[PDB]
Coordinates of C-alpha atoms in Angstrom, one line a residue:
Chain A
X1 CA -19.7 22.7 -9.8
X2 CA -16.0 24.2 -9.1
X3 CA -14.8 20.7 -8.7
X4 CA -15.6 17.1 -10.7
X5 CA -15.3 14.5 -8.3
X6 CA -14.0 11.1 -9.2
X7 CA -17.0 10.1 -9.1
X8 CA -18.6 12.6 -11.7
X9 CA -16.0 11.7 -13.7
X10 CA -16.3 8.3 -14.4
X11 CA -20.2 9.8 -15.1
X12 CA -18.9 11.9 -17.5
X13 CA -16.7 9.2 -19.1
X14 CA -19.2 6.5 -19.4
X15 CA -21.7 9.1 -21.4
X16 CA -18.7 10.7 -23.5
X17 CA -17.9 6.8 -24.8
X18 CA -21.5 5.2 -24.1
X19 CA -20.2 2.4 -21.9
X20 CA -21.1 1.5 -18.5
X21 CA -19.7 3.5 -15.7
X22 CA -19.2 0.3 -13.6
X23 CA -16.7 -1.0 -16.6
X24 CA -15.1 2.9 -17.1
X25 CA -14.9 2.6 -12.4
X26 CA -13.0 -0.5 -13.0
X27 CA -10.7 0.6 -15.9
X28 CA -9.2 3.6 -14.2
X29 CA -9.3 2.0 -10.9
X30 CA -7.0 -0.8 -12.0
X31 CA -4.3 1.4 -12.5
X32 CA -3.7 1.6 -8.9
X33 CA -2.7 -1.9 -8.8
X34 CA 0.1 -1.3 -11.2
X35 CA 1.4 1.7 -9.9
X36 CA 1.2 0.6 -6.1
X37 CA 3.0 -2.6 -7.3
X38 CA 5.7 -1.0 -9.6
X39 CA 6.5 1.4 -7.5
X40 CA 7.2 -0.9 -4.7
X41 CA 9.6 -2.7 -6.8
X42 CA 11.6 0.9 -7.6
X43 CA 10.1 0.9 -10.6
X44 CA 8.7 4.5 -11.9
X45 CA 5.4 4.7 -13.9
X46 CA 3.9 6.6 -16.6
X47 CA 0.1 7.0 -16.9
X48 CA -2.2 9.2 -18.7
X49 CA -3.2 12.1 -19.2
X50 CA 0.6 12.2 -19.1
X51 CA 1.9 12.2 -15.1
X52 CA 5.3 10.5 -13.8
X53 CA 5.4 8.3 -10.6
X54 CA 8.6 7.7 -9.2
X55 CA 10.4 7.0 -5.8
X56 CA 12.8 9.6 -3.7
X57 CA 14.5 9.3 -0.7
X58 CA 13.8 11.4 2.1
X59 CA 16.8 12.3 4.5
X60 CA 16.4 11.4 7.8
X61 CA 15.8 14.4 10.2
X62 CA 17.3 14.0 14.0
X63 CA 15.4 14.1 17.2
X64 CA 15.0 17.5 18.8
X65 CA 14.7 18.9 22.0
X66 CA 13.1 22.6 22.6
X67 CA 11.2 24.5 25.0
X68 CA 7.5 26.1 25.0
X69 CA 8.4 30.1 24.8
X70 CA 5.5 31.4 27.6
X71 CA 5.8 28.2 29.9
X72 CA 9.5 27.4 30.1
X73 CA 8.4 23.8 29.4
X74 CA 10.6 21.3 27.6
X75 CA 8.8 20.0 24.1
X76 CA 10.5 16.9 22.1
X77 CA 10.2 15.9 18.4
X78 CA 11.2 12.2 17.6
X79 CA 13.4 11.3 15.0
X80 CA 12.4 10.3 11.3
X81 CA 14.6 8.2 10.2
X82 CA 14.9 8.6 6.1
X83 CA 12.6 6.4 4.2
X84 CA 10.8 6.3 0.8
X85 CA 8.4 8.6 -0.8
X86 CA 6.2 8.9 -4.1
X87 CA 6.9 11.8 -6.0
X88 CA 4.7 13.0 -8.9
X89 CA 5.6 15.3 -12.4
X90 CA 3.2 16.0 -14.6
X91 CA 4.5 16.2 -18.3
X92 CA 4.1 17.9 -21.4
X93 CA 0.6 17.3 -22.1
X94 CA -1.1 17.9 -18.8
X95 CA 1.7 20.9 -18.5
X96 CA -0.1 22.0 -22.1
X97 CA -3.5 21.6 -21.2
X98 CA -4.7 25.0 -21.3
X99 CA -3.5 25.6 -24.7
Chain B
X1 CA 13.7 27.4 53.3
X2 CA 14.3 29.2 50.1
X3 CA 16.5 28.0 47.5
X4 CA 20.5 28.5 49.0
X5 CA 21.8 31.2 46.0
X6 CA 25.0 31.5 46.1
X7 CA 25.7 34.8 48.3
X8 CA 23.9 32.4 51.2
X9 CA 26.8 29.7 50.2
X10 CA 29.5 32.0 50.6
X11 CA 27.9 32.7 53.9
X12 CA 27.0 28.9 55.4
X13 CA 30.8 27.9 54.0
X14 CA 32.2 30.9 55.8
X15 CA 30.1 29.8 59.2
X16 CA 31.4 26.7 59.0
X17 CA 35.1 27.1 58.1
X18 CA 35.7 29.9 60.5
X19 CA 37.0 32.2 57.7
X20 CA 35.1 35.7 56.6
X21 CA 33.2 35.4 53.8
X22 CA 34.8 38.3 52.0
X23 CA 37.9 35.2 51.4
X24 CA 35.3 32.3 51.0
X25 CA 34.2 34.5 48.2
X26 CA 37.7 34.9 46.6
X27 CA 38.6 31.6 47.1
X28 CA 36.0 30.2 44.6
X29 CA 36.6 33.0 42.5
X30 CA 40.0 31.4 42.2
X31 CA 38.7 28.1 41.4
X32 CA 36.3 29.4 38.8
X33 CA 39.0 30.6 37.0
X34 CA 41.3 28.0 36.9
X35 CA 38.4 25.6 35.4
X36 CA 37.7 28.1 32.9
X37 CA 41.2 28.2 32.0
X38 CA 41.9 24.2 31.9
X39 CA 38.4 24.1 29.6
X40 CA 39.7 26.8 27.1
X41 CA 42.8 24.9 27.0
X42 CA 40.8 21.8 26.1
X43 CA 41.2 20.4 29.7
X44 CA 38.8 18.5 32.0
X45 CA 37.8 18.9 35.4
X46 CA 36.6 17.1 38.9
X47 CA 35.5 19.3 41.4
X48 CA 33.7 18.4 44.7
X49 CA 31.4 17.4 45.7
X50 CA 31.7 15.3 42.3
X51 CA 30.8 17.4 39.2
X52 CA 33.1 16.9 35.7
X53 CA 33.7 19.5 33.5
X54 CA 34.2 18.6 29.6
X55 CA 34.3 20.5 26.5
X56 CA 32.1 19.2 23.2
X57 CA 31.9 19.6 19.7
X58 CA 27.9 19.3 19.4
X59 CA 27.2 18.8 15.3
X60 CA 24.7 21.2 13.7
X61 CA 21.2 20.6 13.9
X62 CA 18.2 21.9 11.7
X63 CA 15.3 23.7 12.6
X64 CA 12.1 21.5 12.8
X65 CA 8.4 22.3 14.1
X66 CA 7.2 21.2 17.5
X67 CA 4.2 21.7 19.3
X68 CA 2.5 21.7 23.1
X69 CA 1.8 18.5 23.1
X70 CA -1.9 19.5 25.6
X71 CA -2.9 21.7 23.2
X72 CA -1.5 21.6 20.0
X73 CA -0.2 24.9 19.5
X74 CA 2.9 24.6 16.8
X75 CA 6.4 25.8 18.5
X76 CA 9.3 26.5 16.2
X77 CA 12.2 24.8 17.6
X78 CA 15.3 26.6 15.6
X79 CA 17.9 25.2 14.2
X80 CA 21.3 24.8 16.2
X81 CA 24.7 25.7 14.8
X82 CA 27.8 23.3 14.6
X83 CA 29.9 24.3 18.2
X84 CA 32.0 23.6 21.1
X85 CA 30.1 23.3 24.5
X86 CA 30.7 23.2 28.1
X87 CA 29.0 20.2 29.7
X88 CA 28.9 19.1 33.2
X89 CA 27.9 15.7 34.3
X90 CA 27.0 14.8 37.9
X91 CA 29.1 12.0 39.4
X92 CA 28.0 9.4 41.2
X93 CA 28.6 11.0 44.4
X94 CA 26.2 13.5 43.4
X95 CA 23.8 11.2 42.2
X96 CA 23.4 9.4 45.5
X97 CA 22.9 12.6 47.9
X98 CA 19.4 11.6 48.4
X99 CA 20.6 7.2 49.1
Chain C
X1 CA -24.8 19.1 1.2
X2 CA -26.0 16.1 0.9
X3 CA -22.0 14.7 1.5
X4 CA -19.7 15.9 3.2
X5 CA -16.1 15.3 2.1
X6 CA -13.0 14.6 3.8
X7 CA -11.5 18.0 3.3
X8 CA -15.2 19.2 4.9
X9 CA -15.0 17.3 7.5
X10 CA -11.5 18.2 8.3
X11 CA -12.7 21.9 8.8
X12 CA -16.0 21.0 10.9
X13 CA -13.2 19.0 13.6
X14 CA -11.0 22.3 13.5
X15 CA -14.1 24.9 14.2
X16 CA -15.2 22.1 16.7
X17 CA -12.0 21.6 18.6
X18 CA -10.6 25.2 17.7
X19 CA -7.6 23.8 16.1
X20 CA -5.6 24.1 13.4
X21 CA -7.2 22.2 10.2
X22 CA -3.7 21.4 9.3
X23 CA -3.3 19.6 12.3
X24 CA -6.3 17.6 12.5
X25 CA -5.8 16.4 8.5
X26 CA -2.2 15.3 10.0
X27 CA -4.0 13.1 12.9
X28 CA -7.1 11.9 11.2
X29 CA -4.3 11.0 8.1
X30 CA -1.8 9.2 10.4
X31 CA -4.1 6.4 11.0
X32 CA -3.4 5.3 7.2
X33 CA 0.4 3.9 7.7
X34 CA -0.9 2.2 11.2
X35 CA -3.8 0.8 9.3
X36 CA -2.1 -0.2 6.4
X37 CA 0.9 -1.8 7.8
X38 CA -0.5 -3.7 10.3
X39 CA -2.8 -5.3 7.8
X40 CA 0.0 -6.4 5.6
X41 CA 1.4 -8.3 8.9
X42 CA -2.4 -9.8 9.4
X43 CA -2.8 -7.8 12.5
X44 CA -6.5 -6.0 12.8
X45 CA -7.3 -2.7 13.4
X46 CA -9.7 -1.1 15.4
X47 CA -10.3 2.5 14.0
X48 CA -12.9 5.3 15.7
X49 CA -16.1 5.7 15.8
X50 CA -15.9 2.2 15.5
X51 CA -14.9 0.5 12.3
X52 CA -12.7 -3.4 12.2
X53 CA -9.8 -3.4 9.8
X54 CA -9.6 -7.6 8.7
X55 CA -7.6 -9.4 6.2
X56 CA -9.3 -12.1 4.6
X57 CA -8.6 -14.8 1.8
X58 CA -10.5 -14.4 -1.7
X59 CA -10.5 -18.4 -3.2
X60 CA -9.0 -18.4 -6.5
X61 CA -11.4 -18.2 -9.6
X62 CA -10.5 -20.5 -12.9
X63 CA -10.1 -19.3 -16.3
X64 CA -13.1 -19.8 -18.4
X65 CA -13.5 -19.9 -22.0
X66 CA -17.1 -18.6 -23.7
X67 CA -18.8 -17.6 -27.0
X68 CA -20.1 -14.2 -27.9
X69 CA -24.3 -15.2 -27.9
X70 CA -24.8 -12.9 -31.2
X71 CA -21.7 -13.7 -33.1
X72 CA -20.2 -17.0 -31.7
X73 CA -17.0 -15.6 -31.6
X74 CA -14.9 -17.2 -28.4
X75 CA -14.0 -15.1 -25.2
X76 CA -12.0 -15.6 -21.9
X77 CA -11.6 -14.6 -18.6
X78 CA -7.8 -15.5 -17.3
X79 CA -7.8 -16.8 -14.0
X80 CA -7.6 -15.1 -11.0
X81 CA -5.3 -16.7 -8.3
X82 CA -6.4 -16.6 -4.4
X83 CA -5.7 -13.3 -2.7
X84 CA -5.7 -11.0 0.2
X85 CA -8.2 -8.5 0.7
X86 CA -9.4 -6.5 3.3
X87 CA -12.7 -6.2 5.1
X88 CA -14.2 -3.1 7.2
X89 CA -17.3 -4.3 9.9
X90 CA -19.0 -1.3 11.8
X91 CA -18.7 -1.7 15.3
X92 CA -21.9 -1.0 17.6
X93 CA -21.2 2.8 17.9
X94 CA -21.5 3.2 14.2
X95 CA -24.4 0.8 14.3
X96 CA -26.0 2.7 16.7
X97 CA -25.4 6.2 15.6
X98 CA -28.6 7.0 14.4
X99 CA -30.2 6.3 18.0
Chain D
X1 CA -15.6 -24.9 -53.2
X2 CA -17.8 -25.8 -50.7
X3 CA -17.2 -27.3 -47.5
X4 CA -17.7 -31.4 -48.3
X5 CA -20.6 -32.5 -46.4
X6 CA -20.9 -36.0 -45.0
X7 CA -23.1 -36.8 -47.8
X8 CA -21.0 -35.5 -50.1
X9 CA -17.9 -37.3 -48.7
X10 CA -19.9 -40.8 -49.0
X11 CA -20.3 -39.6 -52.5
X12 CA -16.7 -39.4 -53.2
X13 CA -15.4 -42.5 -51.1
X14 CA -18.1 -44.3 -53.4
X15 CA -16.4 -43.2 -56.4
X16 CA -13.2 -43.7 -55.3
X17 CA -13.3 -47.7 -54.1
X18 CA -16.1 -48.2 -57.0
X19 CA -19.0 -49.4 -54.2
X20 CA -22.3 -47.8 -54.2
X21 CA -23.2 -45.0 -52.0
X22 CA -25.7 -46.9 -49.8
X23 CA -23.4 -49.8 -48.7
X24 CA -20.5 -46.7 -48.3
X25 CA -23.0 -45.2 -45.5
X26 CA -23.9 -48.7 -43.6
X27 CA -19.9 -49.3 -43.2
X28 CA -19.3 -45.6 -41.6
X29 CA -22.9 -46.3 -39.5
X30 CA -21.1 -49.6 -38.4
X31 CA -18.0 -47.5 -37.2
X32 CA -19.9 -44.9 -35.6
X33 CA -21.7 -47.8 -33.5
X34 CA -18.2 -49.2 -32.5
X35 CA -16.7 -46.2 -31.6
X36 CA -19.9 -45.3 -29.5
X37 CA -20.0 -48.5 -27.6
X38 CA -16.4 -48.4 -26.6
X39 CA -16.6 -45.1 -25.4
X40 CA -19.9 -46.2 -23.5
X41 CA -17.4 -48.6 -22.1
X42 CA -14.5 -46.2 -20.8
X43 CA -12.5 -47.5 -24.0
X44 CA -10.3 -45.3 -26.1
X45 CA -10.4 -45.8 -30.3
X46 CA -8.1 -44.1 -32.8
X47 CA -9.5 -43.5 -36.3
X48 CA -7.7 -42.8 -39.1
X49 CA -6.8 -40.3 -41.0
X50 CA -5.5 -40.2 -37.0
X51 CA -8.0 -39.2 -34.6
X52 CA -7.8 -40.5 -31.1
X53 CA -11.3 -40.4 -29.1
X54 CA -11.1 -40.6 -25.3
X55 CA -13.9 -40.0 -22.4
X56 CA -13.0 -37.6 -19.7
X57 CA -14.3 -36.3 -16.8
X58 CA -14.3 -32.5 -16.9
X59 CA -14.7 -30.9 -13.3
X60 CA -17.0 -28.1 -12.8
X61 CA -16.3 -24.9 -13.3
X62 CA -18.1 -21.5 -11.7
X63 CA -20.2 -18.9 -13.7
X64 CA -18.0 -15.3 -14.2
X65 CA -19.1 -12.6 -16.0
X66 CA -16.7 -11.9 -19.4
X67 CA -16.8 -8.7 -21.9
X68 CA -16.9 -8.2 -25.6
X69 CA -13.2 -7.1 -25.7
X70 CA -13.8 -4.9 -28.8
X71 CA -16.7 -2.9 -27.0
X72 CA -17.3 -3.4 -23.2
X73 CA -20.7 -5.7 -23.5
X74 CA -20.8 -7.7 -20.8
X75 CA -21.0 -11.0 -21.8
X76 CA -22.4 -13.9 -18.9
X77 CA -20.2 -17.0 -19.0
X78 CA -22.5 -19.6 -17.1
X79 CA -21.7 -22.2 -14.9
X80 CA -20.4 -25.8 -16.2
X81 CA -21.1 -28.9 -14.1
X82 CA -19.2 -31.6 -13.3
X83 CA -19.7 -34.1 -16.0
X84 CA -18.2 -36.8 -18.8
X85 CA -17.1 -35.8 -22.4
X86 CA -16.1 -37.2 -25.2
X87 CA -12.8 -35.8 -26.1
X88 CA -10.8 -35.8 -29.7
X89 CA -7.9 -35.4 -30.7
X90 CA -5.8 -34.5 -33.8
X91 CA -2.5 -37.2 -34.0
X92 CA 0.6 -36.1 -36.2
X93 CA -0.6 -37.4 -38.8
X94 CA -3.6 -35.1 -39.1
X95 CA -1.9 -32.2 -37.3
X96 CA 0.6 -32.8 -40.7
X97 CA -1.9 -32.6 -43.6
X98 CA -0.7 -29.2 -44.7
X99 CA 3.5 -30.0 -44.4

């Protein structure tokens, strides 16, 4: 199929290194742990098959008042005010993959 | 009654003042001017029945995407450049017509 | 199919409610950051079509020490200290949904 | 050479303190009696070459399910009850042998 689910994929894995899918399930799921918790501390994270997790700052972006073209009627947005966000990179190796 | 523009003003102030509206008309024309004036020269202004005139610097704002909020459809709010407004603000005269 | 992913499911709600699917991910997605930070102040959440969001306290597990059956060779488990975790609970609509 | 047996350390305490083997065996039987009854009776001994042998009372402990950490076989760690044991312990002057 077009597109392996996580799912299929821990299939996949548990036949490629004959082990049991609930043990390859709970390998690759515990990295969310550490990443969740690392990057709530600021710190940035590095897992394979070679992608970087790190923290940016957003700018906060001001309330706005408008109006609905056809109607004449007066629309709002609310402020955001700036807060944290994940960013991901991938890096060499998954940039290389189709090599 | 229908909405008193202001070529029925000129008239009702005319009825009331004894004068022909031709001079009502050129008497405001005067004032107009000289609170146009006093704003371009940075200036602020009372006029009856209790309405102030200012000048503002209003700060640049960006573009952001709204929408109508019954129905969803997206409406572009566009950005606002940094510049120098006319603002009026109702007094509290004003405000309590209705009291 | 026999499932029917989120991404799926986003585009059934659009050609339902003849909206944009860009819009619906954003609403059906919003819920997240309600859900998730009112759990981390122990406050529930009540979710459509009918789902309870809980906290609830896992009691701490001990380390333990083993043996390998086949080789005798000793093994561990480190403890695991008591925890937060959270608990869904289908409401009666989801209960009842196949009536 | 081969790990000395407890036959084969009667054997060379007999040697040593020039008494036969079967008088060497009904002194350590004695001591083995002695030590049993005042553990039997909540009493601690020491031994040399510096053993100290204590009862305890070992709380139970939970059944949790541990892995061969070289290969991913699960490996069932089962329950311990709540229970007495006899406990030893190496003193310095053991623990020293090697210095």
């Amino acid at each position: 199929k077009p597109t392996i689910t996580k799912q299929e994929l821990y299939s996949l894995v548990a036949a490629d290194t004959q082990l049991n899918k609930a043990l390859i399930e709970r390998i690759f799921t515990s990295q969310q742990k550490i990443i969740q918790n690392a990057l709530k501390h600021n710190q940035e994270v590095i897992i394979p098959p070679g992608i970087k997790f790190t923290v940016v700052t957003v700018k906060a972006k001001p309330a706005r008042q408008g109006h609905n073209p056809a109607t004449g009627e007066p629309i709002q947005i609310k402020a955001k005010p700036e807060h944290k966000a994940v960013k991901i990179r991938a890096l060499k190796p998954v940039h290389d993959m189709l090599n």
